[PDB]
């Protein structure tokens, strides 16, 4: 997260860190056994880490659970990043409490101007590499479809939306990928891509979760 602030220990209970000997992507807990992340975050040997703040120190409240299976959307296109969504089933159900809780799926899509909370342990520098120890937060609004498409001509599909600031200085970044975009208590987006980080006229692009609610439910029900 670039230009954000320190969230505060366990203030974002649904945030998860995907770990393979190091933090490589974020994710969101949607129930005791399932996590939603980005399809481009797929890899074998994933350990899901819940209840984290400082990802380099065991502070208490952490729960490390292995992924039993990862389900990348069948129509995911790695060239366009269309359908950039993946479901991860936990080997064992997580113990839900005040520090580890699930986030609700949306019943309807969010409108432009809606304020959302984006979080993650991704890079905090627009020019260079600097990964934080603790979870970072950023309040950002969903942009109009017209501004999004004007910023990324011919690269925005119906399954994506832009959020952020056109002036630059505030944005999600590498490492935040797969993480949550929560608006009014609902998971509306997944950190997907963007041109660089916090660059002017280049807002972040996110997977539009409201288009996948039926797919998520049907997939979870059959697995
Ligand atoms: C570098 C490029 N990722 C870019 C990227 C950009 C943003 C953003 N500006 N909001 C968020 C997450 C990302 O993963 C890539 O993975 O190829
Ligand atoms: Ca920790
Ligand atoms: Mg990336």
Curated annotation (Swiss-Prot):
Molecular function (Gene Ontology), one example: serine-type endopeptidase activity
PROSITE patterns in the record: TRYPSIN_DOM, TRYPSIN_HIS, TRYPSIN_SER
Keyword Nuclease: no
Catalytic activity: Preferential cleavage: Arg-|-Xaa, Lys-|-Xaa
Enzyme class: hydrolase
Activity regulation details: Is inhibited by scorpion cyclotide trypsin inhibitor TopI1.
Any one annotated GO CC term: serine protease inhibitor complex
InterPro entries reported for this sequence: Peptidase_S1_PA (IPR009003), Peptidase_S1_PA_chymotrypsin (IPR043504), Peptidase_S1A (IPR001314), Serine_Proteases_S1 (IPR050127), Trypsin_dom (IPR001254), TRYPSIN_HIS (IPR018114), TRYPSIN_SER (IPR033116)
Record keywords: Calcium, Digestion, Disulfide bond, Hydrolase, Metal-binding, Protease, Secreted, Serine protease, Signal, Zymogen
Positions of the Peptidase S1 domain: 1-216
Oligomer and partners: Interacts with SERPINA1.
Family, similarity comment: Belongs to the peptidase S1 family.
Protein name: Serine protease 1
């Amino acid at each position: 997260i670039v230009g954000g602030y320190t969230c505060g220990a366990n203030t974002v209970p649904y945030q998860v860190s995907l770990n393979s000997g190091y933090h490589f992507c974020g994710g969101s807990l949607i129930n005791s056994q399932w996590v939603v992340s980005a399809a481009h975050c797929y890899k074998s040997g994933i350990q899901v880490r819940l209840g984290e703040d400082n990802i380099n120190v065991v502070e208490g409240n952490e729960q490390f659970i292995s992924a039993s299976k990862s389900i990348v959307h069948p129509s995911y296109n790695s060239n366009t990043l269309n359908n950039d969504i993946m479901l991860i089933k936990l080997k064992s159900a997580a113990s839900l409490n005040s520090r580890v809780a699930s986030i609700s799926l949306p019943t309807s899509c969010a409108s432009a101007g809606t304020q959302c909370l984006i979080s993650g342990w991704g890079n905090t520098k627009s020019s260079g590499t600097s990964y934080p120890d603790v979870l970072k937060c950023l309040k950002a609004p969903i942009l109009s479809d017209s501004s999004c498409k004007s910023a990324y001509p011919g690269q925005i599909t119906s399954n994506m939306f832009c959020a952020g600031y056109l002036e630059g200085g505030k944005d999600s970044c590498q490492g935040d990928s797969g993480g949550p975009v929560v608006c009014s208590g609902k998971l509306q987006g997944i950190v997907s891509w963007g041109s660089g980080c916090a660059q002017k006229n280049k807002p972040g692009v996110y997977t539009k979760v409201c288009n996948y609610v039926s797919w998520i439910k049907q997939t979870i029900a059959s697995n």
